[PDB]
Structure formats: C-alpha cells, structure tokens
Design an enzyme around this catalytic site. Structure first.
Site, short mmCIF file in Angstrom:
data_model
loop_
_atom_site.label_atom_id
_atom_site.label_comp_id
_atom_site.label_asym_id
_atom_site.label_seq_id
_atom_site.Cartn_x
_atom_site.Cartn_y
_atom_site.Cartn_z
N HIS A 43 -5.94 69.02 15.14
CA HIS A 43 -4.81 68.37 14.46
C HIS A 43 -4.38 69.14 13.21
O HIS A 43 -3.29 68.89 12.68
CB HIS A 43 -5.10 66.90 14.14
CG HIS A 43 -6.02 66.70 12.98
ND1 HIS A 43 -7.35 66.41 13.14
CD2 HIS A 43 -5.80 66.75 11.64
CE1 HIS A 43 -7.92 66.29 11.96
NE2 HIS A 43 -7.00 66.49 11.03
N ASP A 88 -10.71 67.40 19.59
CA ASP A 88 -10.09 67.68 18.29
C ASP A 88 -10.87 68.78 17.60
O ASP A 88 -11.68 68.52 16.70
CB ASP A 88 -9.95 66.42 17.42
CG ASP A 88 -9.01 66.64 16.25
OD1 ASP A 88 -8.36 67.71 16.17
OD2 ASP A 88 -8.90 65.73 15.41
N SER A 184 -9.62 66.32 6.25
CA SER A 184 -9.87 66.41 7.70
C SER A 184 -9.96 67.88 8.12
O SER A 184 -9.43 68.76 7.44
CB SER A 184 -8.81 65.62 8.50
OG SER A 184 -7.53 66.24 8.47
N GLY A 185 -10.69 68.16 9.20
CA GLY A 185 -10.97 69.55 9.59
C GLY A 185 -12.25 70.05 8.93
O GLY A 185 -12.87 70.99 9.41
#
Ligand SMILES: *[C@@H]1O[C@H](CO)[C@@H](O[C@@H]2O[C@H](CO)[C@@H](O)[C@H](O)[C@H]2NC(C)=O)[C@H](O)[C@H]1NC(C)=O
Length: 238
Positions: A43, A88, A184-185
């Site tokens: 994402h 993801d 995020s990530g």
C-alpha cells in the site's frame, strides 16, 4: 506511533523513510534487510518516491544519511493487489547498495517463526497523537504484544476477516500504544527478529481492543529469498 517516546538514535539503523520526490513528504516506513534491498508494504507504493536511510531527526540530519530510490519493485501479483489479510508487501531493490555506517545497518530476515505472547517493538515517524495531526521530528518507538490472530477478527466485523491470514495481530488490549498514520510499511520486531510489516490499524489509533495487522515476514521468506537470488518468477505463499 502512539504511547511511546523518541527512539534511541542507535536502535533503528535498519529503519528507512519513504518520502515524496518533490515536497519531501514522509508517507511510510520500511526496513533495510541487506545492503541493497528494502521491505515495506504494497500500500506504500507510489509512482515516484525516495528512500532515506540513516535518518533520525528530520530537521537536524545525521551526518551519514543516504538517499536511494527504487531500481525495481516486487509484489506478490502483477496487479499489485493486496487485501486486509495477505499480500500487503513490497520488496524494493535500491538503485545502489548502501554501506553500513553509524546510523545504517540492515535487519536480517527472521530465522524462526513468531510466537504469540512475544513482546514486539514498532517504530516510525507517524502521528504521535491518536487523533490530532502531530508528526514528530524524530522517530518514536513503543512495545506492544503479539496476539492470537483470532483476536484481530472480532473487533472489525465490517471487514469479515477470514479465519486464517498471512498477518500478525499486535497491540495492547487496553489501548494506548499503537502504530499510526505515517508508520505503516514499518517493521514489527518481535523477540529480536523482524517479523512484521505494518499493514493497517484503526483510526483513531490506539483505541482499546483495536489491535493492528502486520504482514507476516516469515511466511514470505521463500518469496523474498528467491527474488533476491534473481528468480523473478517466484510466487508468494498461496
Ligand atoms: C485489483 O483490485 C482492483 C480494485 O479492487 C480491481 O478492480 C475492480 O474490479 C471490479 C470487478 O472485477 C470492479 O467492481 C471495480 O470497478 C474495479 N475497480 C475499482 C474498484 O477501482 C481488480 O479486479 C483487481 N485486479 C485483478 C484481480 O487483476
């Protein structure tokens, strides 16, 4: 990151920041896993972005900061599609290798599977307010618990989450500590190993009994190893 404090300047040598090429807006974290590859979430993909390594403070840069860009990006599927329970993940080959320095060094891929009940650490430059829009100058770090995946299903009935996933469920049941927007990530480090990639959580962040999902790095070892070895036809676990 909610509920933590500024990371120690030496404890996140593998943490990288993904930022826009023009405004230099930081939008995701990621993890350096060897001298020329980074793991982050699918994402987090953008048409154009830069990767900062060795960064702690944004406005007072470490002398050894390096910038790289993706040379190649790899996803489970050609569509680059992912879900709330799998896929993801994005593997990035940097345009050129980095040498280790005071503030730069990779985190090796995990050599054992994650165990429920472990204490994990998360880290990033995301919001430090559950609601507001307070983004720190320095990355924050906090410890959370690895929960049974089953725990992540009931709190999110709207997502109708399947009984099994390729994600880990992690957080603090009473709330107050969590990943948040901009983190995020980034990595989930459990009992000394790189076990998760921050995929999604709830907003406001850090609500009681609203744990977050982290793509399970261990389940993807074959895929990661094969891509790095130059087998581009490699597949994610079905
Ligand atoms: C990847 O995901 C996208 C978005 O979820 C899929 O595109 C949608 O396809 C369905 C029908 O198959 C339509 O209802 C939507 O209008 C499409 N676009 C959207 C929601 O933006 C796509 O099918 C997936 N690609 C694959 C499976 O190859």
């Amino acid at each position: 990151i909610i509920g933590g404090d500024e990371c120690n300047i030496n404890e996140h040598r593998f943490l990288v920041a993904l930022y826009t090429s023009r405004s230099r807006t930081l939008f995701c974290g990621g993890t350096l896993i060897n001298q020329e590859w980074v793991l982050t979430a699918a994402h987090c993909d953008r048409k154009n972005f830069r990767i900062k390594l060795g960064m702690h403070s944004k406005k007072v840069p470490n002398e050894d900061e390096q910038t790289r860009v993706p040379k190649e990006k790899f996803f489970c599927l050609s569509s680059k599609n992912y879900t709330l329970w799998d896929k993801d993940i994005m593997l990035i080959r940097l345009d050129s290798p980095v040498k280790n320095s005071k503030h730069i060094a990779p985190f090796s891929l995990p050599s054992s599977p994650p165990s429920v009940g472990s204490v994990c650490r998360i880290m990033g430059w995301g919001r430090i307010s559950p609601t507001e829009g307070t983004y720190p100058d320095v990355p924050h770090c906090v410890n959370i618990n690895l929960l049974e995946y089953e725990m992540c299903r009931a709190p999110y009935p709207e997502f109708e989450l399947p009984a099994t996933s390729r994600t880990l469920c992690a957080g603090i049941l009473e709330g107050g500590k969590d990943t948040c927007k901009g983190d995020s990530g980034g990595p989930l480090i459990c009992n000394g190993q790189f076990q998760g990639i921050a995929s999604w959580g709830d907003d406001p962040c850090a609500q009681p009994h609203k744990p977050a999902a982290y793509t399970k790095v261990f389940d993807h070892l074959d895929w990661i190893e094969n891509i790095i070895a130059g087998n581009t036809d490699a597949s994610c676990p079905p």
